[PDB]
Amino acid sequence: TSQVRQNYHQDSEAAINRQINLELYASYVYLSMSYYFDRDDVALKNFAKYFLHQSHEEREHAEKLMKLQNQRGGRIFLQDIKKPDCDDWESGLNAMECALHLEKNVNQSLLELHKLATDKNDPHLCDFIETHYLNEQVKAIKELGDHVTNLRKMGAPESGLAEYLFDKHTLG
Amino acid sequence: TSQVRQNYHQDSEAAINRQINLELYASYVYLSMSYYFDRDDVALKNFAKYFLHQSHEEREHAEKLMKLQNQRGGRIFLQDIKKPDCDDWESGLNAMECALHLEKNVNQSLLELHKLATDKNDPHLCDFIETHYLNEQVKAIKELGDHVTNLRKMGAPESGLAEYLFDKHTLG
Amino acid sequence: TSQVRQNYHQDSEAAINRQINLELYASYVYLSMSYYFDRDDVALKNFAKYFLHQSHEEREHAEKLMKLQNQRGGRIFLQDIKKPDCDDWESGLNAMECALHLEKNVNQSLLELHKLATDKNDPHLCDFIETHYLNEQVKAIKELGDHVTNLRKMGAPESGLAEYLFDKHTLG
Amino acid sequence: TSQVRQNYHQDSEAAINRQINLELYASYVYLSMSYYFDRDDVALKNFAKYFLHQSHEEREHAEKLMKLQNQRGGRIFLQDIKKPDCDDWESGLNAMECALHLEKNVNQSLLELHKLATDKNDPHLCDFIETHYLNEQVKAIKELGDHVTNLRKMGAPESGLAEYLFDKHTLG
Numbered sequence: 048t049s050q051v052r053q054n055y056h057q058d059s060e061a062a063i064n065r066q067i068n069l070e071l072y073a074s075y076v077y078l079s080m081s082y083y084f085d086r087d088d089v090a091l092k093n094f095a096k097y098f099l100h101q102s103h104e105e106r107e108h109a110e111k112l113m114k115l116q117n118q119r120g121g122r123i124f125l126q127d128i129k130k131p132d133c134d135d136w137e138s139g140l141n142a143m144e145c146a147l148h149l150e151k152n153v154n155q156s157l158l159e160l161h162k163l164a165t166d167k168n169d170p171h172l173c174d175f176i177e178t179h180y181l182n183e184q185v186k187a188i189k190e191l192g193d194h195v196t197n198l199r200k201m202g203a204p205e206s207g208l209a210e211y212l213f214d215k216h217t218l219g
Numbered sequence: 220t221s222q223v224r225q226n227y228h229q230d231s232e233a234a235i236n237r238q239i240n241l242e243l244y245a246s247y248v249y250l251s252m253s254y255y256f257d258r259d260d261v262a263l264k265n266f267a268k269y270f271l272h273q274s275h276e277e278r279e280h281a282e283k284l285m286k287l288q289n290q291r292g293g294r295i296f297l298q299d300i301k302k303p304d305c306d307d308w309e310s311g312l313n314a315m316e317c318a319l320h321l322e323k324n325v326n327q328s329l330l331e332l333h334k335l336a337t338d339k340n341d342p343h344l345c346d347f348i349e350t351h352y353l354n355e356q357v358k359a360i361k362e363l364g365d366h367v368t369n370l371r372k373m374g375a376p377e378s379g380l381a382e383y384l385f386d387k388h389t390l391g
Numbered sequence: 392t393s394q395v396r397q398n399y400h401q402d403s404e405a406a407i408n409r410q411i412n413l414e415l416y417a418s419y420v421y422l423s424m425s426y427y428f429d430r431d432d433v434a435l436k437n438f439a440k441y442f443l444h445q446s447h448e449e450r451e452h453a454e455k456l457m458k459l460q461n462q463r464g465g466r467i468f469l470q471d472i473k474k475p476d477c478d479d480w481e482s483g484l485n486a487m488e489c490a491l492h493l494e495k496n497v498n499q500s501l502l503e504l505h506k507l508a509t510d511k512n513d514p515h516l517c518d519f520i521e522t523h524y525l526n527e528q529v530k531a532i533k534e535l536g537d538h539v540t541n542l543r544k545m546g547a548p549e550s551g552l553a554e555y556l557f558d559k560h561t562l563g
Numbered sequence: 564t565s566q567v568r569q570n571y572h573q574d575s576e577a578a579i580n581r582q583i584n585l586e587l588y589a590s591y592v593y594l595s596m597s598y599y600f601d602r603d604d605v606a607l608k609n610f611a612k613y614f615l616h617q618s619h620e621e622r623e624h625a626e627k628l629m630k631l632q633n634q635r636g637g638r639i640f641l642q643d644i645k646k647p648d649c650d651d652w653e654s655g656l657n658a659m660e661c662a663l664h665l666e667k668n669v670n671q672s673l674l675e676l677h678k679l680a681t682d683k684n685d686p687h688l689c690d691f692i693e694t695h696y697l698n699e700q701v702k703a704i705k706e707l708g709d710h711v712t713n714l715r716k717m718g719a720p721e722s723g724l725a726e727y728l729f730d731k732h733t734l735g
């Protein structure tokens with residue numbers, strides 16, 4: 048037992064490890080998306096930059112979870128990072144919809160983690176999740192919903208002009 | 220009777236109170252409009268900012284009227300601020316048309332107030348209305364008419380691209 | 392159903408709309424108070440400034456709640472803003488006591504909202520209320536209690552000198 | 564007839580000369596008041612400064628009227644400046660009340676002048692009076708009413724402490 052461990056349940060430790068893996072997977076998905084839009088036959092530079100930024104942010108979230116694991120005296124156990132389900136994301140609108148789905152999945156995982164922490168009476172872990180993750184997820188989901196709405200209204204994905212102008216004016 | 224009151228008719232005092240209520244109502248309408256465009260399924264940020272600015276300006280106008288009431292020795296009597304007639308404003312173009320209607324209604328109220336002040340031989344009140352309200356209303360009405368004209372020409376509300384580009388280039 | 396909505400109960404949405412209306416009502420009450428002290432027969436400028444600042448702060452709180460409603464995929468429904476119960480607030484001390492009562496009422500509403508959010512297992516909403524509203528209310532209530540205590544000790548409301556000096560030294 | 568005169572009625576010219584005399588008289592009254600509070604047995608320096616400032620402002624108003632008279636091609640005819648009715652103003656509160664009376668008298672004269680200008684269809688003169696005199700009078704009357712209210716509430720004129728503290732905190 049760690050000399051620092053106090054009020055840290057084994058279930059919480061396992062759930063934190065699972066969340067670390069999920070965040071790394073999300074970072075990988077965003078990396079794939081970013082370099083899809085860097086292809087010469089897609090060529091939407093600002094979409095690529097947006098998704099690369101999201102990938103790096105996901106990596107930061109995973110690293111913060113690992114730091115938390117060590118702070119509380121838990122032990123990090125890493126697992127395979129599965130490859131993204133898709134190789135070709137087919138458009139800016141489709142990529143935004145996939146990102147919205149992914150962010151809502153991550154949010155659901157975080158909500159389950161918070162429920163577990165509440166059940167184990169771990170106020171520090173609950174506060175950590177609330178302060179560093181829940182509002183970030185809400186903001187990300189709202190932003191992605193806004194992007195999807197605007198792309199749909201502009202006529203994407205059929206109108207390539209819509210995605211070009213969205214890339215220039217919203218993501219630029 | 221107030222120690223400062225001079226050449227201030229009771230009818231003018233009542234009309235000023237009515238105008239205060241009308242300005243507060245206009246502020247409320249603009250607030251509703253602003254947060255309609257903040258919805259995830261509307262998502263026109265610059266429309267939202269424009270209407271929030273208009274809401275705050277209307278509040279400032281109401282406060283200036285209250286200051287005038289106290290300056291002349293009248294007594295402020297506040298009333299319920301009625302909720303806006305609409306919950307869903309349905310588009311940028313429709314919201315601009317509604318704002319044009321509202322601003323013309325406020326202008327008509329101000330013109331009636333000026334007529335009352337003229338009939339009561341209250342040059343200070345006439346000058347107050349002329350200096351602080353009439354040209355502001357004319358400018359606001361002209362600007363809203365310009366916005367409506369441009370949105371109609373661009374193809375709004377059917378073309379969501381038109382409203383997106385108007386949001387970026389005119390209101391941005 | 393909104394594309395962004397997740398773990399947001401209908402009861403929470405309704406309670407948020409009620410809280411929006413309550414905050415707007417509080418802003419209206421503070422506006423009335425502020426322009427009572429601007430009267431020529433009251434003439435306590437710093438009381439007026441204090442209550443005007445409180446009114447604007449209440450408006451900001453209402454707008455933050457509306458932003459939250461949109462973030463979570465709820466839909467804002469506005470209602471009439473009822474006029475303040477009083478037209479004449481009768482003194483600085485009486486106005487401070489009324490403000491204390493109002494702030495405690497708003498705090499009770501926020502506590503009920505937090506209880507509802509806890510019952511619906513909405514950690515994001517609980518954290519929102521805790522972070523942005525609860526401590527602000529505690530601080531406001533403490534400040535108003537301090538003001539009431541000092542005004543009472545100085546001999547208000549009977550001693551107009553007490554209210555004049557409190558206006559100059561505490562609120563100035 | 565002056566080479567510049569146009570749409571300037573003789574009645575308006577005479578009324579302007581009367582207003583010049585009234586403004587000079589008001590300046591004289593304020594000068595008397597100012598040096599009453601400079602007496603060693605009164606000794607309220609900030610009251611003296613306040614009334615000296617008012618005296619100089621009245622002189623400026625008279626000079627602006629003379630400039631207007633020359634601009635429109637009228638001819639200035641000066642008259643005796645009568646001495647103030649009082650040599651001893653008896654207190655700060657009494658002086659403020661006398662100043663309020665004087666400012667309301669000047670305002671009534673200006674309103675009669677504006678009525679005359681309106682009857683003679685002299686829009687330039689009406690605008691001159693509105694822009695440079697009417698709101699200044701309203702503000703001065705409101706300020707003097709505020710001062711009287713505060714001095715009365717503090718316990719003046721019986722409480723010399725009230726006038727001392729008003730001199731320090733309001734007029735200082």
Ligand SMILES: CCCCn1cc[n+](C)c1
Nearest residue numbers: 140141142144145148149
């Ligand atoms: C597997 C998640 C699919 C999300 N989604 C919805 C619509 N689109 C184009 C993608």
Ligand SMILES: CCCCn1cc[n+](C)c1
Nearest residue numbers: 312313314316317320321
């Ligand atoms: C009640 C005021 C209606 C104004 N108006 C005109 C056209 N549109 C779309 C709105």
Ligand SMILES: CCCCn1cc[n+](C)c1
Nearest residue numbers: 484485486488489492493
């Ligand atoms: C209706 C709330 C009344 C609060 N209250 C208490 C004492 N005073 C002067 C006011």
Ligand SMILES: CCCCn1cc[n+](C)c1
Nearest residue numbers: 656657658660661664665
């Ligand atoms: C001749 C004008 C008198 C004005 N007045 C009213 C009360 N006090 C003390 C002075």
Ligand SMILES: [Au+]
Nearest residue numbers: 131132133134
């Ligand atoms: Au796939």
Ligand SMILES: [Au+]
Nearest residue numbers: 132133136145
């Ligand atoms: Au896919």
Ligand SMILES: [Au+]
Nearest residue numbers: 133144145148
């Ligand atoms: Au997907």
Ligand SMILES: [Au+]
Nearest residue numbers: 141142144145
């Ligand atoms: Au997808």
Ligand SMILES: [Au+]
Nearest residue numbers: 303304305306
């Ligand atoms: Au409607």
Ligand SMILES: [Au+]
Nearest residue numbers: 304305308317
């Ligand atoms: Au409507």
Ligand SMILES: [Au+]
Nearest residue numbers: 305316317320
């Ligand atoms: Au409308």
Ligand SMILES: [Au+]
Nearest residue numbers: 313314316317
């Ligand atoms: Au409309």
Ligand SMILES: [Au+]
Nearest residue numbers: 475476477478
């Ligand atoms: Au009441």
Ligand SMILES: [Au+]
Nearest residue numbers: 476477480489
């Ligand atoms: Au009350």
Ligand SMILES: [Au+]
Nearest residue numbers: 477488489492
């Ligand atoms: Au009350």
Ligand SMILES: [Au+]
Nearest residue numbers: 485486488489
């Ligand atoms: Au009260």
